[PDB]
Design a protein around this motif. Structure first.
Motif, PDB file in Angstrom:
ATOM      1  N   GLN A  76       6.983  15.561   8.688  1.00 22.49           N
ATOM      2  CA  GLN A  76       6.425  14.856   7.539  1.00 22.49           C
ATOM      3  C   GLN A  76       5.584  15.802   6.697  1.00 22.49           C
ATOM      4  O   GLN A  76       5.626  15.752   5.462  1.00 22.49           O
ATOM      5  N   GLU A 112       0.513   6.337  10.586  1.00 16.91           N
ATOM      6  CA  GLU A 112       0.061   5.926   9.260  1.00 16.91           C
ATOM      7  C   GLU A 112       0.188   7.085   8.286  1.00 16.91           C
ATOM      8  O   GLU A 112       0.605   6.900   7.135  1.00 16.91           O
ATOM      9  N   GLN A 113      -0.188   8.287   8.741  1.00 15.82           N
ATOM     10  CA  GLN A 113      -0.096   9.486   7.918  1.00 15.82           C
ATOM     11  C   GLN A 113       1.353   9.778   7.559  1.00 15.82           C
ATOM     12  O   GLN A 113       1.647  10.180   6.430  1.00 15.82           O
ATOM     13  N   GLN A 133       3.849   7.600   7.386  1.00 14.91           N
ATOM     14  CA  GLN A 133       4.301   6.584   6.437  1.00 14.91           C
ATOM     15  C   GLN A 133       3.785   6.898   5.039  1.00 14.91           C
ATOM     16  O   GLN A 133       4.520   6.779   4.045  1.00 14.91           O
ATOM     17  N   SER A 134       2.512   7.306   4.963  1.00 15.89           N
ATOM     18  CA  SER A 134       1.887   7.664   3.696  1.00 15.89           C
ATOM     19  C   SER A 134       2.598   8.862   3.092  1.00 15.89           C
ATOM     20  O   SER A 134       2.798   8.927   1.875  1.00 15.89           O
ATOM     21  N   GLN A 135       2.945   9.836   3.940  1.00 21.36           N
ATOM     22  CA  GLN A 135       3.647  11.035   3.503  1.00 21.36           C
ATOM     23  C   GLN A 135       5.012  10.680   2.940  1.00 21.36           C
ATOM     24  O   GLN A 135       5.449  11.276   1.951  1.00 21.36           O
ATOM     25  N   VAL A 136       5.728   9.761   3.601  1.00 20.20           N
ATOM     26  CA  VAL A 136       7.039   9.346   3.108  1.00 20.20           C
ATOM     27  C   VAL A 136       6.907   8.679   1.743  1.00 20.20           C
ATOM     28  O   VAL A 136       7.703   8.950   0.829  1.00 20.20           O
ATOM     29  N   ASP A 137       5.895   7.812   1.595  1.00 19.48           N
ATOM     30  CA  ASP A 137       5.657   7.134   0.322  1.00 19.48           C
ATOM     31  C   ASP A 137       5.314   8.150  -0.761  1.00 19.48           C
ATOM     32  O   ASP A 137       5.787   8.049  -1.902  1.00 19.48           O
ATOM     33  N   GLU A 138       4.477   9.131  -0.405  1.00 17.63           N
ATOM     34  CA  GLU A 138       4.063  10.186  -1.320  1.00 17.63           C
ATOM     35  C   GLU A 138       5.257  11.023  -1.745  1.00 17.63           C
ATOM     36  O   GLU A 138       5.342  11.439  -2.901  1.00 17.63           O
TER      37      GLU A 138
END
Lengths: 65, 19
Positions: free
Chosen positions: A13, B11-12, B14-19
């Motif tokens: 990620q 959570e990080q 998921q946030s990274q994917v959204d970003e």
């Protein structure tokens, strides 16, 4: 096992985020260059209609031009 | 302890994917 997989996913990620950031930076640079070119083109655009004679010439030359 | 860290990482991600 699970901890290693979670760490690997986090690393992947992070790598994806870094790649996205690099792409965004490149896009920003391209956008800045395009904006600068457009801004420069604007100054040239402000000065308009080169010569007085040309207006008479406008009748002579083709309409599309 | 470990679970909280895992949740934060998820959570990080998921946030990274959204970003």
């Amino acid at each position: 096992q699970v901890i290693k997989c979670l760490e690997e996913q986090i690393q992947s990620q992070v790598d994806e985020i870094q790649d996205l950031r690099t792409l965004n930076q490149t896009w920003e640079n391209r956008v800045r260059e395009l904006r600068d070119l457009l801004t420069r083109y604007a100054s040239r655009r402000e000065d308009s209609m080169s010569l007085g004679a040309r207006d008479a010439e406008l009748y002579h030359l083709p309409v599309l031009e | 302890f470990k679970k909280q860290v895992i949740k934060c990482l998820e959570e990080q991600i998921q946030s990274q994917v959204d970003e």
